[PDB]
Amino acid sequence: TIIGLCTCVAIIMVSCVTSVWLLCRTRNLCITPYKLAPNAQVPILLALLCC
Amino acid sequence: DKTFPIMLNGQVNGYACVVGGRVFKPLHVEGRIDNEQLAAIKLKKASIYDLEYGDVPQCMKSDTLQYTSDKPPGFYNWHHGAVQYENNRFTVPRGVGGKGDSGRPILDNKGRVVAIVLGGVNEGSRTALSVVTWNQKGVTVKDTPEGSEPW
Amino acid sequence: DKTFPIMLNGQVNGYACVVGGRVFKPLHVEGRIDNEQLAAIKLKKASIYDLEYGDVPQCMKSDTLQYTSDKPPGFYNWHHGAVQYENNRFTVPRGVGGKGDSGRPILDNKGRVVAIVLGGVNEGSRTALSVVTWNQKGVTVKDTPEGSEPW
Amino acid sequence: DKTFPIMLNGQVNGYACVVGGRVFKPLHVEGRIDNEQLAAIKLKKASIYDLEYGDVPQCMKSDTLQYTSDKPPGFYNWHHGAVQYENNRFTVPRGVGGKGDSGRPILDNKGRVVAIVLGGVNEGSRTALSVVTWNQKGVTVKDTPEGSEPW
Amino acid sequence: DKTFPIMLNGQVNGYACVVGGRVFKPLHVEGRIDNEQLAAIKLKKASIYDLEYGDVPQCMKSDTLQYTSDKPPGFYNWHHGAVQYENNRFTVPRGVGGKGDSGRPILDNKGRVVAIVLGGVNEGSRTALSVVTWNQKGVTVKDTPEGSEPW
C-alpha cells in the first residue's frame, strides 16, 4: 500500500506537470503570433480556446 | 534613431529595432544592445520567429515604427538600398546584405515596416531574404526560403 | 565641468556636484553618476539632509566648487538663470524649476556655491525651492518651505 | 596606433607598446590598456625584465612596430624629444624624462624599436634611462643604472 | 604561357606552373589542367609539401620558368602585382588574392620563380601567404603561417 500510494502520487505529479506544461506552451505558441502584431483582429474565439 | 547596433566584443553582431512600442532583435545574436535605454529591457523569447521582444520606455513609444501588412508586389526600401518583392519573397542584388545585417527592417514608401530581415540565401546573381512579416490577416509569420541561413 | 548629472536608465534624473572637495548627491535620487572617477567612491548617507557625500579623488580635489555662508539679500543664479533670495527663501519664477533639478547648486555673483536645490513649492507668483544651505554660523541646515516636493 | 597608453584612475601612468606583433608593457604600471582589445588578452609576466607580454589580436599582428638589435652610437627619438646613445648607455637631456614615460619605445631612423624605457637617473648633467633592449646576440637584455627610479 | 588554370566544372580552382622543368600544382586543387599535354601527365603525390609534380614533356620543355634560392628581403612580382617579403615572411595587401590563386608563382627582379603560393592568412591591413620555398641551401620547404587557409 505504501509503494502503491507513493507511485500514484508520483504519477499524478508528473502527469499534472506535463499537462500544465503542454497547455501553457500551447498558449504561448498560440498567442505569441498576435503579441508581435498589436493591430490584429484577435478573434474572441482565440481568447477562449488558447487561454 | 530607428536601428540600434548590437555589440558582442566591440564589433556589431546585429541590429535591434523598435516597432509600435515593441523592440525586436535576433534571437541567435549574442551581445548587448548599444543603447542604455534598450539594454535595460528584459525581453521575452519567441522561438517561432527566432526573435526576442518587449516593451520600450515611455520616452521612445512616441517615435516607434508603424506596423503595416499591405505588401503589394514591387520595390521596397531598406538600410542597404531597395528590396524587390516578388512571388511573396524579398530578394536583393548579390552582395547586398550579409553576416551582421540580421534584424534590419524593410519599409515601404510610406515609412511603415513590412518585414524584419533575419537571414537570406546566397544565390549566383541574387539573394533571397529570410524575414518575419505578417499575412493578409495581420498575424506574424516567418518566411524562410529553402537554404536560408541566419545572418 | 564641475556638475555631474546622475543617470539611472540612460536618462538624467538629478545632478551631483563637488563642493569644497566633497561630492554631494541627493539621497532621493537613485542612479549612477555619469562618470568613472567620481562613481567609484563609496558614498556616506546624510538622511537628515537628504544628501549623500564622499571624498573627492586626490586628482580631483583641486577642481571643486567653492562655497560661502554669506548670503546677502538679492539675486543669485543657477543652471536655469536668475534666482531670487529674499525673506530667507530661495525662489524662481513659476515653471522655471521642476522635477529632475535635484542636486543642482545655486551660485552667487562670485561663482561660489550658496545652496543645493532638492525640491520646491509653487507659490502664487514664484516657486520656492527646498535647498540645503549654511546658516550665518556656517552650519549645514536644511531650509525647506511648507509642502515641498522632492525633485 | 602602435603605442597605447595605460590608465589606472583615468590618468595615464604608462604605455603599452605593440612591437614585433606582441604587447610589451611594464609590470610596475598597473591599469587597463587604452585599446579595449589589447586589455582583453591574457598576458604573461617576465619579472626578470620588469615587463608583461602577450600575443596581439589577429588584426594587430601586421600593424606592429618592427625591432632591431643594432644600436650604434648616435641619436634616437621618443615622444619627449631626442635620445642620445653613447658608451652603450641611453642618455637624455636634463629633465626630459619623468614619471609616466615608462613603456615608450625608443625608435631609430627607420621607425624600428631599439629599446623600451622603464626609468632613469638624473646625473646632474644628463639623464640616463633604464631600458629593455637586445644585445649583440639578439637576446632580450635589461639595462638599468644603479639607483634608477621606475617611471 | 607558363601558367595554366585548373578547372573542375569550368570554374578556376587553382593554377599550375612549370618551374625548373617540373609541373607543379597543389594537392587541394581539384580539376583538370586546360593544357592536355600537362593534364595527361601522371603526377606524384608529395604530401610532405601538398604538391603534385611530374616531368615536363619534351614538346613543352621550352615553357619552363627558372627558379632560384637567393631571395633577399624586398618586393617580388606575381599575377596580382607586387609582393613584399620580410623576416622570412611573404606578405600581400589584404584583398589581393584569394581562393583559386593557389599555385601561382612569385618572381624576382630577374624573372626567376622564388615561391609557389598555397594559401594565406589575413593579418589586418596585410595578408600573409603560405608558400613553398627553398632555404638558404636550396632545399624545398613549406612555410605555413598559423591558421592559413588553402586557396
Does the annotation count C79 as an active-site position? no
Residue C48 is given by DSSP the state G
Distance CA B97, CA B80 (A): 7
- Which of A32, A35, A41 lies at the smallest CB-CB distance from B138? A41
Distance CA B75, CA D145 (A): 74
Kindly report the backbone phi and psi dihedral angles of residue B61, in degrees, each rounded to the nearest multiple of 5, phi listed first: -55, -35
Handedness of CA C19, C23, C29, C32 (dihedral sign): positive
Residue whose grid cell is 516657486: C127
With an 8 Å Cβ cutoff, the interface of chain D facing chain C consists of 9-11
Distance from CA of D30 to the nearest CA of C (A): 16
Amino acid identity, position E147: G
- Which of A36, A39, A42 would you mutate first to test chain B, the one with the most B CBs within 10 A? A36
Closest CA to E51 of E8, E88, E19, E11: E19
Do residues B130 and B148 make contact, with C-beta atoms less than 8 angstroms apart? yes
> Closest chain D residue to C39 measured between Cα atoms?
D9
Give the Cα-Cα-Cα angle B69, B37, C43 (nearest 5 degrees).
Answer: 170
Cβ neighbours of C57 in D, within 8 Å? 9
Do residues B128 and B145 make contact, with C-beta atoms less than 8 angstroms apart? yes
**CB-count exposure of residue C72 (10 Å: 0-12, 13-18, 19+):** exposed
Containing H/E element for C77?
strand C74-78
Contact B22 A29 (CB under 8 A): no
Do residues E17 and E3 make contact, with C-beta atoms less than 8 angstroms apart? yes
Distance from CA of E127 to the nearest CA of D (A): 9
Containing H/E element for C128?
strand C126-134
Do residues B78 and B106 make contact, with C-beta atoms less than 8 angstroms apart? yes
Residue whose grid cell is 589577429: D58
Handedness of CA B131, B136, B141, B146 (dihedral sign): negative
Do residues B119 and B150 make contact, with C-beta atoms less than 8 angstroms apart? yes
Closest CA to D138 of D48, D67, D53: D67
Do residues D133 and D143 make contact, with C-beta atoms less than 8 angstroms apart? yes
Give the Cα-Cα-Cα angle B55, B150, B110 (nearest 5 degrees).
Answer: 55
Cβ neighbours of D66 in E, within 8 Å? 87
Distance from CA of B50 to the nearest CA of A (A): 12
From the CB coordinates, do chains E and A have 3 or more pairs under 8 Å?
Answer: no
> Closest chain B residue to A34 measured between Cα atoms?
B139
In this complex, how many residue pairs, one in chain B and one in chain C, have their CB atoms less than 8 Å apart?
11
Do residues D150 and D142 make contact, with C-beta atoms less than 8 angstroms apart? no
Would you call B80 an interface residue with chain A, using a CB distance cutoff of 8 Å? no
Burial string for E121-130 (b: 16+ CB within 10 Å, else e) reads bbbeebbbbb
Closest CA to B102 of B37, B26, B19: B26
CB atoms within 10 A of CB D150: 16
The 3-state DSSP class for residue C40 equals helix
Residue whose grid cell is 564589433: B11
Contact A36 B24 (CB under 8 A): yes
Do residues C3 and C16 make contact, with C-beta atoms less than 8 angstroms apart? yes
Contact B67 A37 (CB under 8 A): yes
Helix/strand/coil (H/E/C) assignment for every residue in chain B: CCEEEEECCCCEEEEEEEECCEEEEECCCCCEECCHHHHCCCCEEECCCCEEEEECCHHHHCCCEEECCCCCCEEEEECCEEEEEECCEEEEECCCCCCCCCCEEEECCCCEEEEEEEEEEECCCEEEEEEEEECCCCCEEEECCCCCEEC
Distance CA B29, CA B36 (A): 18
Contact B139 A37 (CB under 8 A): yes
Contact D61 E124 (CB under 8 A): yes
Longest C-alpha distance within chain C, in Å?
Answer: 46
C-alpha cell at D110: 627607420
Give the Cα-Cα-Cα angle A36, A38, A41 (nearest 5 degrees).
Answer: 110
Residues 6 or more apart whose CB falls under 8 angstroms from that of C32 comprise C6, C7, C8, C39
Do residues D116 and D131 make contact, with C-beta atoms less than 8 angstroms apart? yes
With an 8 Å Cβ cutoff, the interface of chain B facing chain C consists of 35-37, 40, 57, 59
> Closest chain E residue to D59 measured between Cα atoms?
E124
Which chains does E contact via 3+ CB–CB distances below 8 A?
D
In this complex, how many residue pairs, one in chain D and one in chain E, have their CB atoms less than 8 Å apart?
17
Residue whose grid cell is 501588412: B69
Would you call A45 an interface residue with chain B, using a CB distance cutoff of 8 Å? no
- Which of B21, B67, B139 lies at the smallest CB-CB distance from A33? B139
With an 8 Å Cβ cutoff, the interface of chain C facing chain D consists of 36-37, 57, 59
The 3-state DSSP class for residue D90 equals strand
Does the annotation count B130 as an active-site position? no
**CB-count exposure of residue E143 (10 Å: 0-12, 13-18, 19+):** middle
Do residues C151 and C120 make contact, with C-beta atoms less than 8 angstroms apart? yes
**CB-count exposure of residue E95 (10 Å: 0-12, 13-18, 19+):** exposed
- C-alpha E144 chain-centroid distance: 13
* E runs forming strands in E10-88: 12-19, 22-26, 32-33, 44-46, 51-55, 74-78, 81-86
Does the annotation count C102 as an active-site position? yes
Residues 6 or more apart whose CB falls under 8 angstroms from that of D54 comprise D22, D23, D41, D42, D43, D44
Cβ neighbours of D40 in B, within 8 Å? 9
Residues 6 or more apart whose CB falls under 8 angstroms from that of C88 comprise C143
- Which of A29, A37, A39 lies at the smallest CB-CB distance from B48? A29
Contact A35 B137 (CB under 8 A): no
Which chains does C contact via 3+ CB–CB distances below 8 A?
B, D
C-alpha cell at D135: 644585445
Closest CA to C31 of C12, C17, C47, C18: C12
Contact B35 C10 (CB under 8 A): yes
The 3-state DSSP class for residue D37 equals helix
Cβ neighbours of C36 in D, within 8 Å? 10
Strand pairing report for B66-67 and B112-122 = parallel
Residues 6 or more apart whose CB falls under 8 angstroms from that of C12 comprise C5, C6, C34, C100
Cβ neighbours of D62 in E, within 8 Å? 91, 123-126, 128
CA distances from C24 to C36, C79, C110, D40, D80 (A): 16, 17, 20, 34, 39
The 3-state DSSP class for residue D117 equals strand
Closest CA to B142 of A45, A29, A25: A29
Handedness of CA A6, A7, A12, A18 (dihedral sign): positive
Q: Which position among C1, C47, C102, C148 bears the catalytic label?
A: C102
Give the Cα-Cα-Cα angle D31, D32, D38 (nearest 5 degrees).
Answer: 145
Q: Which position among B102, B108, B130, B148 bears the catalytic label?
A: B102
* E runs forming strands in chain D: 3-7, 12-19, 22-26, 32-33, 44-46, 51-55, 74-78, 81-86, 89-93, 105-107, 113-122, 126-134, 140-143, 149-150
Give chain C's end-to-end CA distance (angstroms, integer).
22
Distance CA E76, CA E108 (A): 5
Rg (CA), chain C: 15
> Closest chain C residue to B40 measured between Cα atoms?
C9
